[PDB]
Design a protein around this ligand. Sequence first.
Ligand SMILES: OC[C@@H](O)[C@H](O)[C@@H](O)CO
Ligand SMILES: OC[C@@H](O)[C@H](O)[C@@H](O)CO
Ligand SMILES: OC[C@@H](O)[C@H](O)[C@@H](O)CO
Ligand SMILES: OC[C@@H](O)[C@H](O)[C@@H](O)CO
Ligand SMILES: [Mg+2]
Ligand SMILES: [Mg+2]
Ligand SMILES: [Mg+2]
Ligand SMILES: [Mg+2]
Ligand SMILES: [Mg+2]
Ligand SMILES: [Mg+2]
Ligand SMILES: [Mg+2]
Ligand SMILES: [Mg+2]
Lengths: 388, 388, 388, 388
Amino acid sequence: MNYQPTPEDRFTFGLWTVGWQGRDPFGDATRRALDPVESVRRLAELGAHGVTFHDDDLIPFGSSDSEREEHVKRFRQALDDTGMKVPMATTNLFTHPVFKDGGFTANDRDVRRYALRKTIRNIDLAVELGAETYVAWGGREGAESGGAKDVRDALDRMKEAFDLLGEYVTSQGYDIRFAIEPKPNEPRGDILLPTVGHALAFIERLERPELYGVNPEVGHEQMAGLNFPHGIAQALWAGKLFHIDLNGQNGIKYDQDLRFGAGDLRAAFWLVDLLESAGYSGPRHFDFKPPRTEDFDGVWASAAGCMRNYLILKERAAAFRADPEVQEALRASRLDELARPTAADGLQALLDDRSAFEEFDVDAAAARGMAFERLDQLAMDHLLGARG
Amino acid sequence: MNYQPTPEDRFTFGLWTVGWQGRDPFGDATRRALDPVESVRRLAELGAHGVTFHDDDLIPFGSSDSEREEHVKRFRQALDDTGMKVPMATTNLFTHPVFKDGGFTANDRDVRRYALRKTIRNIDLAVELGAETYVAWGGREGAESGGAKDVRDALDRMKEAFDLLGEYVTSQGYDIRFAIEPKPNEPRGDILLPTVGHALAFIERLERPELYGVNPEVGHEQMAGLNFPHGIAQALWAGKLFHIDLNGQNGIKYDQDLRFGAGDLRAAFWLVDLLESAGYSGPRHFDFKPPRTEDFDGVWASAAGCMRNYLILKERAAAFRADPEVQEALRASRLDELARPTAADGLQALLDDRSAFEEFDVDAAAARGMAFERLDQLAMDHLLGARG
Amino acid sequence: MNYQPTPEDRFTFGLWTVGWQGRDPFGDATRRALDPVESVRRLAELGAHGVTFHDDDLIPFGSSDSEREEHVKRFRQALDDTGMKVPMATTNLFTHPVFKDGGFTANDRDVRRYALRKTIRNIDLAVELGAETYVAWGGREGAESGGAKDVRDALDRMKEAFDLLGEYVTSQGYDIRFAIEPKPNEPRGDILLPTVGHALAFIERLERPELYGVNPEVGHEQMAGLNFPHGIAQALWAGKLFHIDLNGQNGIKYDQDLRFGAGDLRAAFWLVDLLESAGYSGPRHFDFKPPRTEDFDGVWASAAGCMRNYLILKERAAAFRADPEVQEALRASRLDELARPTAADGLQALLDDRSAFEEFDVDAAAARGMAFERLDQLAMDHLLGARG
Amino acid sequence: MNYQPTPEDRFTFGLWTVGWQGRDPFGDATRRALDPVESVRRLAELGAHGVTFHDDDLIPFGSSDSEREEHVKRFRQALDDTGMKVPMATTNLFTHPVFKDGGFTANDRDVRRYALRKTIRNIDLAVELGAETYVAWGGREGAESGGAKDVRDALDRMKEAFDLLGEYVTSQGYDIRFAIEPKPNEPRGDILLPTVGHALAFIERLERPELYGVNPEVGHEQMAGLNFPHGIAQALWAGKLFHIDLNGQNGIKYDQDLRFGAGDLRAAFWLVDLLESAGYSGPRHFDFKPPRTEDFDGVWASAAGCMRNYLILKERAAAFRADPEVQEALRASRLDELARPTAADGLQALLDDRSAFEEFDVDAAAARGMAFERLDQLAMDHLLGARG
Ligand SMILES: OC[C@@H](O)[C@H](O)[C@@H](O)CO
Ligand SMILES: OC[C@@H](O)[C@H](O)[C@@H](O)CO
Ligand SMILES: OC[C@@H](O)[C@H](O)[C@@H](O)CO
Ligand SMILES: OC[C@@H](O)[C@H](O)[C@@H](O)CO
Ligand SMILES: [Mg+2]
Ligand SMILES: [Mg+2]
Ligand SMILES: [Mg+2]
Ligand SMILES: [Mg+2]
Ligand SMILES: [Mg+2]
Ligand SMILES: [Mg+2]
Ligand SMILES: [Mg+2]
Ligand SMILES: [Mg+2]
């Protein structure tokens, strides 16, 4: 009937999301800045579980150690007052002009050293605040032109950076894991580690791969026209889905950061189905921007709608999977056979099995329908709640 | 002045490329079939090093063991007559209706067993013909709808298939490596292992990863709007570029398979620069389709142009890298600094280095220009041969 | 509760849709051909209003005048037996190799003359069968390369063709209008008149513009990443929406021709809302392809689902527009003000109105929220039937 | 050999291009603001013909009539000192928060009235400064969500606005024409009049269509994956190319505004070929952004490169068209036949011509090759200056 979030639903929001002032490449801010304390409060009242932050969202850049301390304690007090948690944190290595060519892979060596020190400083803070995941979105790592960046050297520098962060964390005894967030472009012409697959592959080259996973974002993979639930299944299959950023995107264009549920709705349905089915237990984090058309009432409406749409899709996906008619259609489409080993009998028995080749009736096989269209219309009926 | 290929340039072509009859989703064949023997001949005269094949290009489907033998010997004779080599081969697991839901990840278990046997049969043949690389393009592995395919189960099946192929090859003592060819879509709505990064990550989960690399294709990565030279640098960095398919593509749309050099020309320039710089020593294979507007004279013209454009770009990229003014611009943009370790002095010295944070002049750093636009115009002048 | 189509709903299907055999650029047919008579029958039983055809779907190419006549009479008999209508027809100017460079804008003048005669022949037939709309999809009008086609000369040839067709129709006294179907690419690299807007503009240059409108297709505009309901509003605004092709498409890639409702579901919702609101009274034609994974049972399931999804969306859009809370949100977002003239008082009164500039409070204006996010979540709740 | 621009080449630049400070959606300004007077100067020294402006680039928003006057006279003095012209001007209706939902089609009626008054004020100024073209880019006219904007009502409002501007200009006796600049998205989710074709069609509905043309932009049409030279040929064919914005774009993604020549290089070649061939005589205006990686030396380098690349492409396109071998290839591909009327003999003679149908040899026609691949490689050789 209705769909109210509880903190048990693990919904979390970045300070920068509801706090986005509405500045875009062609326009000035349309909303005033939000005090972090005020956001914690408002989010708590909406049913959220926690918030996340960039170092610079919380502690304004160039802050004295003194001012730093005051900012953290007011924040901490808001968290104690509301019961809100801080499950993830990250570093802003993209806004300040010093990062115009990147942080960890900037051509200037002194900038790469500064980016590491800025990062290390905020990992200590995140650990204090209790975060369990440290996200890294290398927004400025990339190029607008081919000669500007040797990508093998840049990958060496990127691995060097993450390996040093891993050494730091292990030597401190910290219980925190890293999650690399890929994005194919924007604000660089091309960004390094453009998709979930590139980040997964990169991780396997690190000195301690087990400390690193991915933080995929709905809109990022869709900016490359990729199927996000598929990319998430691959990350789940690799054991690397450490966090996830949820939002909406209408296709291949600039990253819109629409509220979750907006953009590609069927994709959202299949994503919720997979997360709930796979038992994903991390935060459901919304990395989104209330449109600049909105005032603050529209900001909290947008934030509420993220949660609402997740909870509606979860109910429709559970209804779909629990429907006996759907379970029969799944067997009719042979999903059960997909889950069985192709050749548990082993290579030699396969080579020896004439039914697998010499005597296989390929024409009868080809004639069998997969029945996928009836299955997909049942999924559609369930999503629309039209199961007459 | 001019640009004639020699077999030393390692240019190779699939039988299916120049042999494409011009059938597309809206139209009938516009050219008659080509005899493989005739293609070997014509390609040899154009300066090509070798050819490649799908099992079904060479031996028509459903061929008796008898007919099989005759097809192979005529082919072999053409190769002896011309000096042409066969460096790579692959399996057609996409054309026959039995593969409509996939080969290795078809939901029907008996189809997956047949796909493995069909593959194993052609690996023996490729080894006989001397191929060093066996390519696998899983064109039908994927879905048009979310419920049709559990992607974790499909990845299990895909790993199972490649692991069995690796066991086969090792138990036979064969000297051949596999190269997985990613593609994001077409002819399935979404294909599994959609990009070079997804294939790289997948490989690391196989039982013997060292037997497997990638075969990226220019147009495939551009169908996801990705930067192909970047994806190739990542594959080179991982030690996994085992083969490469060259062609041209105009952006995000159906896969056009234009001749190499057509489509995104600057991308082609940066790709040739990287392959020649990195010392890539594999075949330069053209996987392309002469447009259906063409007769056979236009087919060989198209094939010649692939080679011609590679050789022109190689000369311009070598001229660019050898130009002292470009080498100065590279230092001005700090490419040399990119190649130096960020922190060879180690974590503790970095943490102890006040010049990396406490005393770093971020405002002076931010003010330094990267000089990338002057570097890129030198690259452009060289490509256009306008170095006045 | 449930959603059965009646012939009053004006649902129509091309013979080529349910009759698609499953041939794609990488694969053989997976279904046997369908007899047109059988399709008419099956569609009638599903609740369809009528069917459409290319000349070549009905009368196989190169048919004697004799065979032609027999094909038409069996068809006609099926229509009499079922009550099915034929509201639209079109010409196949894309499949035969003679059309490889186009029909009306082929470089060869004799091919352009043949394309006109082939077209004229089928207009007489369509008129006999009672069609009210003749569609023209110039699938082969275009180029893969810049020098192959002078586009100003091609536009001259295209206008020449349509002007001659208009002269023909007027001199025969026929009551039929033409509808130009744009598509941005596929099967040519770029097709002429790539979007609804280009076709609208072209029409205004014809000798009798009033005889011509557009036949936009859902998937075609989405292949250019465009908003289809917006393009349809522009066509409605121009008085030119003469027919519409419905299907589903997942973003910018090859044209998938998914059943209607699949692909971008929210877009489908906003399209149905606009058609029903604007009083569009033409056929709701499905130009789609049952996936090649399917057997014939899946074909009719796919066809039924097209109708079902339209009828479900129509109910949700009517519920949305009839909801008093939505009507209040529309006024809160000032949709009512959008419909009022900006300056009914005229230019001089506007120039004289100090409240429009000298004394306009721009800061108070900027501060007003548009309230669009709350409106969009009401639309979402209605679509999902979650109006608790 | 080398390629120096002269003011006779009609190269022009917006104040906002070289003056872009480097603010993007994720980052702060990296360059200090430029004084307009300084830009005029620097551009003059580079060989530019003139500059253009938004009202707000020249006169800071909220300026007293007094300050206004001083800004204009310093500007005017710079123009007198350098000989620079001001051929085009436009209005900023996108930056100030008051325009967050649009200018001419904002839902708030008072905002639409203010947008017209702001525009009228700057047309008087542009006319004083001698501009011949007034550009209108409706950057904020559009929506992020379907219910936010009734597009038929918005088109009514947009027509109302342009009709009032036309009445104003005619009643003042001003010699100035308007040029509508389409863009498919960014910064709105979808923008109204998304492509050259939609703007062309819209214009035909205005009260005095002859006062309005288009200002297409390279990167804008490529953001929809469209062929820009094709769109320009259609605009030329309609007599509506009144101005053009040149830059570079790498495919379908955020609008990059790269210098001209960057992005799709072959497209740039075919565009220059068409403009020079068609005798386009308007300004060659660069609407581009020097990358934020650059300091001011890189800004002027980027600006110089725009001009340089145009002049190099113009030389290669003229060489291509003047090459007797290319003129023979054009006849071999039947470009000459494309330019001949299909049926100058008229409808009745066509219907009576048995050679056009009854006796047309379709099989011999189909067999003729179009020879486009050889033609395209000649175009490629010329572009690369490899005409051995
Ligand atoms: O595209 C922007 C990215 O989504 C960031 O918001 C990261 O999630 C956090 O730095
Ligand atoms: O898109 C098609 C693929 O490129 C294939 O040609 C593989 O390279 C070989 O099966
Ligand atoms: O993309 C193919 C087109 O949609 C055609 O089906 C036309 O509608 C009819 O020729
Ligand atoms: O995408 C931004 C547009 O190109 C503008 O620069 C217009 O040309 C001028 O307002
Ligand atoms: Mg984002
Ligand atoms: Mg994110
Ligand atoms: Mg391909
Ligand atoms: Mg290939
Ligand atoms: Mg289609
Ligand atoms: Mg259609
Ligand atoms: Mg732009
Ligand atoms: Mg512009």
